[PDB]
Design a binder for this molecule. Structure first.
Ligand SMILES: CC(=O)N[C@@H]1[C@@H](O)[C@H](O[C@@H]2O[C@H](CO)[C@H](O)[C@H](O[C@H]3O[C@H](CO)[C@H](O)[C@H](O)[C@H]3NC(C)=O)[C@H]2O[C@@H]2O[C@@H](C)[C@@H](O)[C@@H](O)[C@@H]2O)[C@@H](CO)O[C@H]1O
Length: 586
């Protein structure tokens, strides 16, 4: 083992910061990114507390599809990254970089990344200590004949240099299963046997119409727990709204894949946090997002989605490290071995812990995420772990997995019901994590959670998550329901058919819209009500350390009922919010 260039784990999570090459301007002799971010400007704008946990991910996007283009662009930016001087201290502080080296099967008709040899990658690793890793993303839909052989080389050249190979992929057409050798292409399987400590595997939830969210995330978690990857994460993509044909929030009708650039703007901001919770709560530590202009920002400025949701969520996972592999293994009661492709893919979990075929969310935390590995792999390194002796390792073909009903009946015996109400809730140590799991339906949800004898009832509108921590002097609360009004994008269309026929916003038009109507002159959503009821309380609680998105919340209202020893907390907000309540139990 060569010394790793960086740590990636629960205590050192990783936020990837994508910068997409502008190929049109490249043809004009410029070195720029779509959305107007600069490498240096973006890095400088990253908050100093986040800098140790964030890496700039270069992507070749629409660079010319010919030899030399991607190399020329990448060498230019690695030079900029390497020579960076911190203006406050005057010291050279090389900016850490990940290069996107593989995507779209590296077909010469799809990407300039085709003309990046492993020899060149090796050269850049040796030249640039700030090159921390290389990234393969989104070939599920174009599974090239030598993809597994090429992934083996990427992992090996990374290991050789102490860098990470990062692969984001979704289980469309058995991609994850094939990667590990299902169809007999075993090169990457063998590479992983030697070099897994340098591999990061991530889901990529983009192809949402295929509904592989639950099954891909289950693999990512199981690969990690069984030592087939060093850590895991997910790329969470607002393009899912396009893939599934949604339009105006809560509107009826499906428009199909007809308004791409309006559609990738429409996913509620807070829903990205709901998606990211599934990574964190299950020991994942790597985060990435598309579309970058919405999820991160433009012109070296943070979008409100980034500042109010993603940034604050990432700060949370740094302050409260995700459960360790040891911890997750200890809590795991069932571990699946086999191919989800043989068992209905995402349908496997529908009405088990997901409410529908096409969703990135869960409807219960009762089983958290059941971890799995493809049938091609062995559970040897899993059983070698000391923390894994209480786990039932089960073939996916077992009768307990044969139907929806059999799955719940089997899992219910091993995972006890630990809350009430039709809402998503999961508990870690002294913390309840809660969200409303509705995607595009305006329906409130309620739950009853307990901290021993203390009862907490909550009422959540859609696109609202909360983290409730029992501390010695009371309850720490994090709430996020940030959701701006996107209706303007869908102006002039009263129904789905009409929305289909709107003029294309276009990629450049959407970037412009962000600049003109999201970065500034934002159409904020209306404040909306969250209720929290605590039963078993001695006196009216006091509120402390209240803060949140500027101008986004009314002062919380507390109504204490001495006779019933209970308080009703009414919050009216639209944003990120945190406070503590101080009280004693009765
Ligand atoms: C040949 C073909 O059409 N291939 C499709 C893939 O490109 C799709 O991958 C992503 O799908 C999105 C739609 O769900 C979208 O097209 C996205 O690209 C657009 O957005 C990104 C930033 O998010 C860039 O701005 C791209 O320039 C822009 N492209 C277009 C034409 O609008 C696709 O993601 C990109 O491409 C893939 C291959 C990876 O390289 C990603 O890292 C890129 O961001 C796929 C969806 O399942 O569908 C294929 O048919």
């Amino acid at each position: 083992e060569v010394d790793k260039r960086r740590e990636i784990n629960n205590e050192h999570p990783l936020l990837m910061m994508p910068l997409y090459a502008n190929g049109e301007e490249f043809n004009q002799g410029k070195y720029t990114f779509w959305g107007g971010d600069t490498l240096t400007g973006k890095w400088e704008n990253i908050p100093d507390d986040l800098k140790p946990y964030t890496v700039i991910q270069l992507h070749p996007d629409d660079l010319p599809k010919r030899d030399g283009a991607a190399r020329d662009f990448y060498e230019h930016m690695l030079e900029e990254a390497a020579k960076y001087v911190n203006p406050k201290t005057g010291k050279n502080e090389p900016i850490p970089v990940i290069l996107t080296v593989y995507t779209a099967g590296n077909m010469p008709y799809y990407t300039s990344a085709h003309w990046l040899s492993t020899s060149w990658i090796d050269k850049m690793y040796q030249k640039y200590p700030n090159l921390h890793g290389i990234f393969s993303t989104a070939s599920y839909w174009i599974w090239a004949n030598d993809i597994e052989n090429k992934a083996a080389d990427y992992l090996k050249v990374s290991a050789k240099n102490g860098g990470y190979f990062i692969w984001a992929e979704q289980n469309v057409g058995s991609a994850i299963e094939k990667a590990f050798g299902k169809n007999g292409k075993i090169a990457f399987q063998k590479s992983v046997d030697k070099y897994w400590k340098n591999l990061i595997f991530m889901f990529k939830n983009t192809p949402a119409a295929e509904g592989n969210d639950s099954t891909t995330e289950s693999y990512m978690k199981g690969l990690w727990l069984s030592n087939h990857t060093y850590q895991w994460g997910g790329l969470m993509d607002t393009w899912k709204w396009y893939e599934t044909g949604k339009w105006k929030l809560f509107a009826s009708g499906n428009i199909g894949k007809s308004q791409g650039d309006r559609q990738w703007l429409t996913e509620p901001e807070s829903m990205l946090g709901e998606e990211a919770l599934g990574v964190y709560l299950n020991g994942g530590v790597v985060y990435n997002f598309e579309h970058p202009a919405y999820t991160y920002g433009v012109n070296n400025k943070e979008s409100l989605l980034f500042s109010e949701v993603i940034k604050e969520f990432f700060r949370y996972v740094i302050a409260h490290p995700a459960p360790s592999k040891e911890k997750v293994l200890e809590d795991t009661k069932v571990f699946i071995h086999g191919d989800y492709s043989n068992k209905g893919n995402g349908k496997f979990f529908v009405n088990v812990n997901t409410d529908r075929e096409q969703t990135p969310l869960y409807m219960t935390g009762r089983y958290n995420v059941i971890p799995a590995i493809p049938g091609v792999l062995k559970t040897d390194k899993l059983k070698e772990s000391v923390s894994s002796s209480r786990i039932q390792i089960k073939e996916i073909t077992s009768p307990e997995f044969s139907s929806t009903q059999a799955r719940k009946e089997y899992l219910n015996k091993l995972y006890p019901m630990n809350y009430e109400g039709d809402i998503f809730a999961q508990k870690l140590d002294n913390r309840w994590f809660v969200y409303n799991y509705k995607v595009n339906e305006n329906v409130k949800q309620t739950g009853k959670l307990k901290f021993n004898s203390l009862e907490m009832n909550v009422e959540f509108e859609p696109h609202t998550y909360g983290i409730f921590e029992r501390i010695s002097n009371g309850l720490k609360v994090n709430l996020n329901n940030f959701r701006t009004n996107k209706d303007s994008l869908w102006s002039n269309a009263q129904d789905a058919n009409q929305a289909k026929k709107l003029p294309q916003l276009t990629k450049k038009g959407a970037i412009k819209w962000i600049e003109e109507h999201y970065i500034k002159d934002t159409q904020f959503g209306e404040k909306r009500v969250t209720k929290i009821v605590l039963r078993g309380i001695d006196k009216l609680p006091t509120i402390h350390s209240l803060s949140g998105t500027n101008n986004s919340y009314d002062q919380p209202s507390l109504n204490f009922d001495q006779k019933n020893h209970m308080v009703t907390i009414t919050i009216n907000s639209n944003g990120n919010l945190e406070f503590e309540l101080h009280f004693l139990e009765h």
